[PDB]
Structures are given as C-alpha cells and as structure tokens.
Amino acid sequence: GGINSQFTRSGNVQGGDARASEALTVFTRLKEQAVAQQDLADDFSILR
Amino acid sequence: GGINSQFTRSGNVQGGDARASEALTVFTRLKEQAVAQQDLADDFSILRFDRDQHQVGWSSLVIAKQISLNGQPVIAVRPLILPNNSIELPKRKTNIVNGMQTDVIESDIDVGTVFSAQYFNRLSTYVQNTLGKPGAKVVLAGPFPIPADLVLKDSELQLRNLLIKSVNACDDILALHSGERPFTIAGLKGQQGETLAAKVDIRTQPLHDTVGNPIRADIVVTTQRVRRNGQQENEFYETDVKLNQVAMFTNLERTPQAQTPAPWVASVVITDVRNADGIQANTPEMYWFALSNAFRSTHGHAWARPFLPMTGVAKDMKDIGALGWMSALRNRIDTKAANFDDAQFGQLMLSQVQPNPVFQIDLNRMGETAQMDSLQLDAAGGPNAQKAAATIIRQINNLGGGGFERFFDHTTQPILERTGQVIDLGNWFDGDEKRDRRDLDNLAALNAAEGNENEFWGFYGAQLNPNLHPDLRNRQSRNYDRQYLGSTVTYTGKAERCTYNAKFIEALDRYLAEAGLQITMDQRFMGNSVIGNNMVSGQAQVHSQYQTGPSSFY
C-alpha cells in the first residue's frame, strides 16, 4: 500500500493477472479463424 | 602445459567454460525484455567474471549499479556464483591420529569457502577497472549462488525474478548508504481505525525459494492488516493485507540425565524470514519486526500442533509414538487407534515434553538474507563482536522510538550464542515431488531405527560431539542421510545453527508491545492447578556434656 509509495525502490514486482490476457488473445485468434472459415458471423464482441 | 606447446598438434580440445556465456546471453535478453515492458530502468550493468582469465575457483555474474554521493562515486555489486558440475575442485586433506596409526581424510569444498576476502577483492578491482573508475567505493549487496543441475533453457521466470530482486537489493543498499528515513512502527497506526492481526498456520508441503529450492516449513506465522469497517465494500476482494511471514519447525533434543522433569526438550528452529510479495523494499528495521512474530507462536502452544497425528494417512516419518522407545516401557505408543485422541495426547506431552520451547535460527551466509545472517554470525562471536552488537542495538532503537536500555543491556548480556553445529543444505527427490534434506531430524532417525538405541545414539553424537573432529561428523551425517533418505540427495550449501538469548526475545517483545503495537488473534478435568500457589512455609510457633581440656591459647 502506502509503504511502497513511501520508499519507492526502482523496479516492479507482481501486481498483475496473466491468465486473462492470454485467454483473450486465444479467443480473438479463434474467432478470427472461425470467421475466416465461414463458420460464424461478425456480429458479436469479446470483452475482458 | 608446456607439453602442448612442445608438440603442437593441430586442433583444440576443451579449455573453456560453457555455463557462463549462455547465462550472460540469457540475462541480457531478459534485461532487454524487462526494459521493453517498462519494468526496470536502464541504469545498471551486467558483467561476467571469467575464472580462466582471473584464476578463481568459480565464475560469477555481477550486477553493478553506480550512483554519485557528494561527488564520490559509489558502486553496489551483487555477485552470483555459477557452480559447474563438469569440473572438480581439488579437495582438502586433513590428518587425525588414533593410537599408533595416522590416516588422511578427504573433505569437500562448498560454495561458501570459495567466496573469500581475496575473491571479493579481485572482483572489486575488476569492476573498478571495467567501469572506468579506479578509486570508486564498492559496497557488497549479498551474494546468491545459482544452484547446479538447473536447466537455464526453461527457467526464465526464476531468472527474471532473481534479476528483479537483485536490482531491488542494490537499490536498498544504495539507499541505506545514502541515508533515508528509518522505518518505525509509529507510522503503522494508519489513523483509520484498523488493527493488526496475526494468523498461525500448519503446513505439510515445503516452501520454495526464488530458484525452486525447497525449504522445510511446518509452522507459518503471518501478520495482516484488518480493515473491516461497517458497510465494507469489495466483497470477496482483498487489497494485499499482509506484511510478514516466518517459517518455523520444531525439533526435539534430549538432555543427559540418567534413568519429574520431562526427558525431552522441544527446540524450535527458524528457517526463513521474509516480507510480503507486494512489498519491494527490504530494510534492516523490518527484519526485527518480522522476527518478533516468532515468539507469538507460544500463545496457545501452537508449536505442538504439527505433532498430533493426522487422520487417514500415516507417513510414519514424523510419527510421535517412537518417543516411547526409551520411555519406562520399552515398546512404542501405538497411535492410529480408536481409543487414542487428544484426551491423553496432552497427558503424554505433559509427562514427556518440557512445557517451554527453545528458539534457534539457521543462519546462512549465502542465502537471500545474507547481509543480516553475516551480521548476526559476527555478533555471535569473533573479532567483530562489540561493533555488531552496537549496530543491532542502534537498529532496534531506531525501530520504535528508543529507550531499549530499560529492557536489555548489551554490555553484560550476550545476544546470540553459537552451538558449534554445521547443517548441510540439500534436496532429496521423494517419490511424489522434490523435498528438503532437513526433513531428517531426531524423530525421523528414531522412527527409522525402531529399537536399536546404539545406532541412534551414534547418529545423535555424529551431530554435536565436541570431542570428535567436524570433518568426521560431516562424513557420518552424509552417510546417515544416504542410509535413510535415498540416493537422490543433492547438497547445495552449508548453514550454521545458533541459539538466541532467552532474555533477549522477551525484552524485544516487551519493548515492541510497550511501543504502541497491538496485535490480536485467537476438554476433561485433570486436577486443581491453583491450589499449590498458597502453601504455608513455616511451622506453628508455640512457647511450649561438652567436656573441655587444657588449651595453650587461653
């Protein structure tokens, strides 16, 4: 919390979620592939 | 040597180290990736310390960051040793005598003995010459070896975390040398109506280091900030409310009394002390605040909780029934029974275990907290005994106001004591997963050897016999581990065990408690425990030859 802002050592550790961005990228690639193969229609959206 | 130059056959063989260039390339790529993602700042350098052209035992990687203080350059270095399994260092020979025969003992050399004063002097001179500053001051930040048998091709995350932690340590030491505001508990009030709570935990899987090294941990004590207001929002969401963590495990030692005091005494060993993951700062005054949590484990005899049997499984390695082998009855007490429960478990602990524990620490000069372990080792005993104690007292005074003299007197009271015990550091691969070598303790050896007391006594003497030479003790300890654990043992370093002063812990706890720190946390009749306090000492008071001879003196 305020301890990090009180000392402010250079460099960043943790503070992120890495099982969401990769899933979003995978889903976007899968949607693009499905649309290319005339399997779906470009009328929906994917959000995080 | 000169033979090759005397014949000069075409072609070259060997003559190189291949576990340094690849590591340097990996570290450069990781640094570039981290800088690209706005994770670090381009202000530090990575250099290689080749053993071939410096004539040293092991090659190393050094991370140097330099600043300017009042016009005087200052360089901070964090060397990383790189042991290799493809080459063998020459061993150390020692001689002992037995009667009329003398023999030679071939010992082994660890990583710690390699990092000597001459090694650091050569490293500092090389860094000074490379960076273009011949007279710059160089300050150490704490070595950290990279264990062997580790494939660098698929270990990118551990190396990245190690690099970030090394940069953080360099920043910490530079800031400490420059001079900043000390961390005090007076600033932890928060003035928002919150309280600090300590949670105890019992674990069965070992903790892991930043490089995957397992660490034994049975009792874990943590400190958190509880900010539960009335209509608290963010249900199921928590904002990093955690400050410290201490890993502890208990071990039993037997006092030498022939056969009312319990035969065995429980000693608690502190293995790892660390802060929260979110906190990126490491200062000396946080170490004592975190260490103060160790004494809190005795609030409800929580150190005995791992000893009680678990229901359903029995690894038979930590069984407490083996303690009955040397009891009044020869056989072992049989747990895992319908009748057995906590009703007489307390009776057993009262009748065969001392109520009070003992606190010990496994100091390591090559661990993550090397800069404090070395200081405590120096304070334990040596040429630098007064300076280390004065520094520790000054730090404790800086943490929480002052006036520590009312509770402790370092002039006529030792802080730390050295028991003359050396502990190997290694890991053995269990059938399921890799474990820690320190799982083998007195209870484990007693369980392995069911009734043969002489073998167990030999094992116990192989640890703390003052008469026997230390090399023989290390040899016996290395043989016993192979005998019991398995063939997968892999040693990685050395550690030393020390015993804290009994009054020092209580004085520190009372000083922190009086300094405005408030921490809150959490059957069959046996007899009257209070009738014995009131006892009449005296007896009722009611009214109800020596022939001599001549003496020249009088």
Strand content of chain A: under 5%
In which range does the helix fraction of chain A lie?
Answer: 40-55%
Question: How many beta-strand elements of chain A?
Answer: 0
Distance between the termini of chain A: 26 Å
| Protein chain pair with the most extensive contact, residues per chain | A-B, 11 and 21 residues
| Tally of alpha and pi helices of chain A | 2
- The coarse overall form of chain A would be rod-shaped
Question: Rg of chain A from C-alpha positions?
Answer: 19 Å
Largest sheet of chain A, in brief, is: none
Order of helices and strands of chain A, N to C? HH
Oligomer: part of a larger assembly
What class, by secondary structure content of chain A?
mainly alpha
How would you describe this protein?
The structure is cut from a larger assembly and holds two copies of chain A. Chain A has 48 residues and is mostly helical. Helix content of chain A is 46%, strand content 0%. Chain A has two helices and no strands. The longest helix of chain A has 16 residues. Chain A is rod-shaped and about 55 Å long. The two termini of chain A are 26 Å apart. Chain A: Homotetramer. The tetrameric protomers further assemble as a square grid. Chain A: This is Chimallin. Chain A: Belongs to the Phikzvirus chimallin family. Chain A: It comes from Pseudomonas phage 201phi2-1.
Descriptive tags:
part of a larger assembly, 2 chains, 48 residues, Chimallin (chain A), structural protein, Phage
